[PDB]
Design a protein around this ligand. Structure first.
Ligand code: K
Ligand code: ZN
Lengths: 33, 76
């Protein structure tokens, strides 16, 4: 699968399909908030 | 003066600010609105990361300008 930047605005991490396009860090914060 | 802060969930936060307001203050306002600790906050305007000590006017942020908020863990 081709690499994709995270779906979060201004985040330069790579997102993953498990986190619905989010990177792991942002997906974790999304749970928090 | 009103500015907008877009979150990772695409949620848009409206803040009442002054051109003289520092980035640190804006982060405190975000904490009041969202409960997000300032140290985890990264503010982006025009693709550049904003330093806490600088002001909105320093970064040429205007009325109804939109800022981007990125959240990051602090491992230290
Ligand atoms: K992105
Ligand atoms: Zn991300």
């Amino acid at each position: 699968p081709p690499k994709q930047r995270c779906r979060a605005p201004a985040c330069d991490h790579f997102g993953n399909a498990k986190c619905n396009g989010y990177c792991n860090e942002c997906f974790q914060f999304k749970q928090m908030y | 003066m009103q500015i907008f802060v877009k979150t990772l969930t695409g949620k848009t936060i409206t803040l009442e600010v002054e051109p003289s307001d520092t980035i640190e203050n804006v982060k405190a306002k975000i904490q009041d609105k969202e409960g997000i600790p300032p140290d985890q906050q990264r503010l982006i305007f025009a693709g550049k990361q904003l330093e806490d000590g600088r002001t909105l006017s320093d970064y040429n942020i205007q009325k109804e300008s939109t800022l981007h908020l990125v959240l990051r863990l602090r491992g230290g």
